[PDB]
């Protein structure tokens, strides 16, 4: 219940103090349920999983403040949930190579857009429908012989602009997605060192 | 003849309630005690009978 | 099964008049003996199980029952 | 044109109403001949809806068999299947042979979605408890029945 794995971490604490001196300090947004997925084949032996809870995020780390003792500064670092997915081998190409297997989304009202959103020059594959979603927001769509085609390459959300709600039906009717969803790696920590 | 959303809107104010077993009043659906005095804040409650 | 006998007797309370109380004993079963003491005494062979009850062996009676208990 | 299609064929049971018209139909090739030869290529399952893969090519659609491990559990468990009558309290049971633990492995190594012959002693119990059989107790009793007291590679 709420008593059963509560006492087994403070036995299995040390099993990874003395083994694995290398973490990729990933920042936890949208770790999804449908989009962390088509990835396997880059990460076979470079990785681990074990517990972590905010309730002992203090207690067993201060119990660990004693083996290699310059070991305090993480707590103002993780402002949220930031998982330290370990690694073993490479110094730079696992900082690198977690980039090559991700699969993007359906155009959703609800995410954030930090960069430019582009809308392609492509037909919708449908008949006579309502053009008010293209002709009230500022996109040139015209009826093209049953089919509806995006006339000019109209961009929606530029570099650092928030996502509007009622502007997703054009890429959803095209089934084509702005950018690759997945999980973002945030920080670096290597052997008594920090970067930003 | 009727939209099933506006109808979901009109089931809320008329047909999702909880009824006392003592004074036959009509309470909001997440309630545990009657708000009256002539029954004594009794904890006998039922759902309202759905349509047949 | 202790949390269903309070519930059975909470209902049996609606047939009798007056007022009465439900009490969980400190004995073992339908005996007159205590809770923990019972297993150390059965273990040192002072008490004998007889179905619903138990018999007490003193140090007073003659010896042949003692030998018929140890042997 | 290469289109590997998912179909839920009824195996050795020649079906009455299949699921072939909204999936393969609008391509142009007829799925009526194939629904029978696939049950023929099944043969001795006859009970089980092992899903059969079909790959539509430019000439025709091919037939591929996709092996399992929980349907090799139904291979290790050889019970009488039932007819159309379809009556409850159906959930089969039995005794799985300890060398059928070996032989379901020797056909769930072609898929190879697991570990080896000594790493086979969960697959035939923990879903086998939802299909319906036990090897002397479920996975919780076959914890101490299987922990490091084996002689199987």
């Amino acid at each position: 219940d709420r008593a059963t794995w509560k006492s087994n971490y403070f036995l299995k604490i040390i099993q990874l103090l003395d083994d694995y001196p290398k973490c990729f300090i990933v920042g936890a947004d949208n770790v999804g349920s449908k989009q962390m997925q088509q990835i396997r084949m880059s990460l076979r032996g470079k990785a681990v999983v074990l517990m972590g809870k905010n309730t002992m995020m203090r207690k067993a780390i201060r119990g660990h403040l004693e083996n290699n003792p310059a070991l305090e500064k993480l707590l103002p670092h993780i402002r949220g949930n930031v998982g330290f997915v370990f690694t073993k081998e490479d110094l730079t190409e696992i900082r690198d190579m977690l980039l090559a297997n991700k699969v993007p989304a359906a155009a959703r009202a609800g995410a954030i857009a930090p960069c430019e959103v582009t809308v392609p020059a492509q037909n919708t594959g449908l008949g006579p429908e309502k053009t008010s979603f293209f002709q009230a927001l500022g996109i040139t769509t015209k009826i093209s012989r049953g089919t509806i085609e995006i006339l000019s390459d109209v961009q929606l959300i530029k570099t650092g602009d928030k996502v509007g709600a009622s502007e997703a039906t054009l890429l959803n009717m095209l089934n084509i997605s702005p950018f690759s969803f997945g999980l973002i790696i945030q920080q670096v920590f290597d052997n008594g060192s920090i970067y930003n | 003849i009727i939209e099933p959303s506006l109808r979901q809107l009109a089931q809320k104010y008329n047909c999702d309630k909880m009824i006392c077993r003592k004074c036959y009043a009509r309470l909001h659906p997440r309630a545990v005690n009657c708000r009256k005095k002539k029954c004594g804040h009794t904890n006998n409650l039922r759902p309202k009978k759905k349509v047949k | 099964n202790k949390e269903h006998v309070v519930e059975a007797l909470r209902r049996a309370k609606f047939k009798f008049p007056g007022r009465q109380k439900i009490h969980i004993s400190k004995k073992w079963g339908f005996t007159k003996f205590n809770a923990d003491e019972f297993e150390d005494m059965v273990a040192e062979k002072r008490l004998i199980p007889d179905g619903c009850g138990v018999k007490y062996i003193p140090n007073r009676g003659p010896l042949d029952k003692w030998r018929a208990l140890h042997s | 044109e290469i289109k590997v299609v998912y179909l839920r064929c009824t195996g050795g049971e020649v079906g009455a109403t299949s699921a072939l018209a909204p999936k393969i139909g609008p391509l142009g090739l007829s799925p009526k001949k194939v629904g029978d030869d696939i049950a023929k290529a099944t043969g001795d399952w006859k009970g089980l809806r092992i899903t059969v893969k079909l790959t539509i090519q430019n000439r025709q659609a091919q037939i591929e068999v996709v092996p399992s491990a929980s349907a090799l559990i139904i291979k290790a468990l050889k019970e009488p299947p039932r007819d159309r009558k379809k009556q409850k309290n159906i959930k089969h049971s039995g005794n799985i042979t300890f060398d059928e633990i070996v032989n379901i492995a020797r056909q769930m190594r072609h898929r190879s979605l697991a570990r080896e012959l000594s790493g086979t002693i969960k697959e035939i119990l923990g879903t086998a408890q939802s299909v319906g059989c036990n090897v002397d107790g479920r996975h919780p009793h076959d914890i101490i029945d299987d922990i490091n007291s084996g002689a199987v590679e």
């Binding site: - | 009727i2 109808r7 047909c15 349509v51 | - | -």
Partner: protein, 190 residues
């Protein structure tokens, strides 16, 4: 028991300057002023800070019956600031099955006639509360939007045309008619 002290504070944004003379507060800003007197509650209203950047309210030596009055004034003040900066807009639909519901506004937003309800020839001369300006919606088939600033004058007058049109002597699991309330919102948006 007797609890010795309980307080609560409210931050105010800088489009609004507030003050108080005694116990009645006044709040003026982009859409007008509002005044509400709290002279039946017996607490202490203190307004700390240069530029008046937040408020604080206390109650000394109070039981359980009057620790309730710490938050339910902070709410009628956050509502006092919202009804001056933003302003309220209640949207309410109009369900009907077979006959047409006719809705007509008299007095430039300050009166509502209602016709043809369940075939009743009896018009309903519903009056608003002074402060609230009704309107028929746009870009929607059947909809009213009530606008105003004071929420107390808005919501009671909104519920008046909800109780004006009821059903006599029949089922209300089957006879589902009336002008019901859909969405509680503000005039403009932050």
């Amino acid at each position: 028991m007797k609890t010795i002290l309980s307080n609560q504070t409210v931050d105010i944004p800088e489009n609004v300057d507030i003050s108080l003379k005694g116990r009645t507060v006044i709040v003026k800003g982009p859409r007008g002023t509002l005044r509400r007197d709290f002279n039946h509650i017996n607490v202490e209203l203190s307004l700390l800070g240069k530029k008046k950047k937040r408020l604080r309210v206390d109650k000394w030596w109070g039981n359980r019956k009057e620790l309730a009055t710490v938050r339910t004034i902070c709410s009628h003040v956050q509502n006092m600031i919202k009804g001056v900066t933003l302003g309220f807009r209640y949207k309410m639909r109009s369900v009907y099955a077979h006959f047409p519901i006719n809705v007509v506004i008299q007095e430039n937003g300050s009166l509502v006639e209602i016709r043809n309800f369940l075939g009743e020839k009896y018009i309903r001369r519903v009056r608003m509360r002074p402060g609230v300006a009704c309107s028929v919606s746009q870009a929607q088939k059947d909809e009213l939007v009530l606008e105003g600033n004071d929420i107390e004058l808005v919501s009671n007058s909104a519920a008046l045309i909800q109780q004006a049109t009821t059903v006599k002597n029949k089922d209300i699991r089957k006879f589902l008619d009336g002008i019901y309330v859909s969405e509680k919102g503000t005039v403009q948006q932050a």
